[PDB]
Every structure is written in structure tokens, then in C-alpha cells.
Amino acid sequence: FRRTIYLAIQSSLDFEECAHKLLKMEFPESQTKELCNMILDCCAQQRTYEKFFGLLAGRFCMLKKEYMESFEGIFKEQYDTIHRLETNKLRNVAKMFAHLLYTDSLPWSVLECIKLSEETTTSSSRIFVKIFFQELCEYMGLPKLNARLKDETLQPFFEGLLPRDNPRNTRFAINFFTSIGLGGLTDELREHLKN
Amino acid sequence: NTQELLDLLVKCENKIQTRIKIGLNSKMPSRFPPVVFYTPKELGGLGMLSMGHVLIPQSDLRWSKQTDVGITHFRSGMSHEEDQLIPNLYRYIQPWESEFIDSQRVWAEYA
């Protein structure tokens, strides 16, 4: 099954036909978690990130809710085990998930998986989040990313990402987003350190 | 993005295969299954690279001349055995936009 998904991707030049060919084979719903998973893995094998895989995954996210939920699961699964990946495969998965987040194929809710601390994050995880946010910034821009990143309806989700409880973690995450080049996102944290 | 080319490429791939079959004094498709063409030269085949086994995207003529609409149908492209899926040459090439983004990032990091 993994082989036939892979040959279907490589045989189709455009993203639209790739989706058409996968839908025409009519897998059962029990397969769908694997199919989405395969679409990610094929994406990671490339040299550079190619828009094809982000668009193919997005079209699957718009067709049925099953695929969208399944990609939400894969984000958490992949982020848990990021240290297994080589650096290119890591960069491609980061850019693909940034693509899904930017085009709103995927809820921002998944972003509660990420928890920033000295002891919570491994080094590869820190690189993953760097590429992810550096990329989301590049698509949206700082004002847009700020506007979406501090929001009333998404307040509970980002608390692991923007750690208000512990001053040591708050100083860590401020330093983290600063060294990336996304200093602006830290400013409301800085005030919370001052108070 | 150019549909004229995709039509032209399907025609051209079929002309090359048909000229090889003419050279062998036969055009019967079952003496010449695609394995004899697509197999790499390291295994004894001709090793031709493929572009014409794609589905060609199409929309209604009267509106597509008039504006840019969505792909609503597909035409076939070259015949193959329906379980088999010949690889596409375009897939194994990075797009130029991807290459330009990557290039500046790589050079910046080298400095």
C-alpha cells in the first residue's frame, strides 16, 4: 500500500491529478491515517521543500474531515519524535506543516503540542520550531502572525508555547524567539516579566 | 501550466515508440509491452524517460477560452497497463522558485 501511494505520487505531474488518482482508488477509511502519513514521508525525502506536497495535503484536508483530523494527529506524532530525523527531512516536515498552518487547512489548536523549556525540548525540537516559525513569519509577516498568535479564543492552547507560570521558562522563551529573529512576539512576555 | 506542451509531449513520446516498432516490422502492442521501452539500459532496455503517461487536465472549451477556470476533467495520456504507474520526469526536478529560495539561504549560511 505504501508503494502504490508512492508510485501514484511520482507518476502525477500536477497536485490535482495526484489527488484525483488517490481518490479514485477508494481506500476504506481505516487506511486514511496511513495515507496521510505516507504523503508526509514522501515529502520529507525531497531535496528542497516543494509546494506540491503542501497543496496535496491541503486538498485532502478540504475534502473530508477525516483527513484533517488525521493530519492533526500526525503533527503531534512527528513533533514527539523529531530527533529521529535527519536535518533535511526535518526542514521539509517543518515547511510542510507551516504551509498547512498558513493556508488554514489545519487548526492552530495543534500548536498546543509545543512546549518551550530548557528541559522539555531536545535540540532537534528546537531547530524544528525555529524553521517552523521562521517560515510562518515569511508567509504571513510579523503583524499578521502577532495578531493571530495572541488571540482570545486561542488563549489556552499557546500557554506551553508562551510560558507565563515560571519566570525561568518565561526568560527562556523570550530568549528563544529573540534569537530566531522573531523578537516582536516576545514583547507581552517581557512586560509579564517586568510585573 | 502550458497545455499545448502536454499534448505535444504525449504525441512525441508515441512517435518515438512507434518508430522503434516500425524498425522491427510490427506494431502489435503486446509484442511491445512498455517494459521493453521504460526499463533502464543497465538491464537491457532502451531506457527512455517518460513524460507522456500523465492525465491531461481539461475544462469546458467555451469558458476556458474566456477566463481561467478550474480543472474539471481529465483526458488520458498514453496507454498503460492500468495497475502500473510510470514515473514522471518532472517530479525528479526541483522547480526554479524552490531553487532560488534554497540558493540564497545556502549561500547566506556559507558566508
Binding site: - | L61, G70, T72
Partner: peptide
């Protein structure tokens, strides 16, 4: 040529001219 889609003749195209609808429309 049904519904304004397809080749008026499949002859010299290099293909059988079978046309199906796009299944990934939203």
C-alpha cells in the same frame, strides 16, 4: 465531444481519448 470537453477526434493524439471527471473538486 460530450459537454464541450474532449478531443473532437482521438486520431493522431497518441491516446484513446478517455475522459473522466475530476474527483478532487471541492
Amino acid at each position: 465531444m460530450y459537454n464541450g470537453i474532449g478531443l473532437p477526434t482521438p486520431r493522431g493524439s497518441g491516446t484513446n481519448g478517455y475522459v473522466q471527471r475530476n474527483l478532487s473538486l471541492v
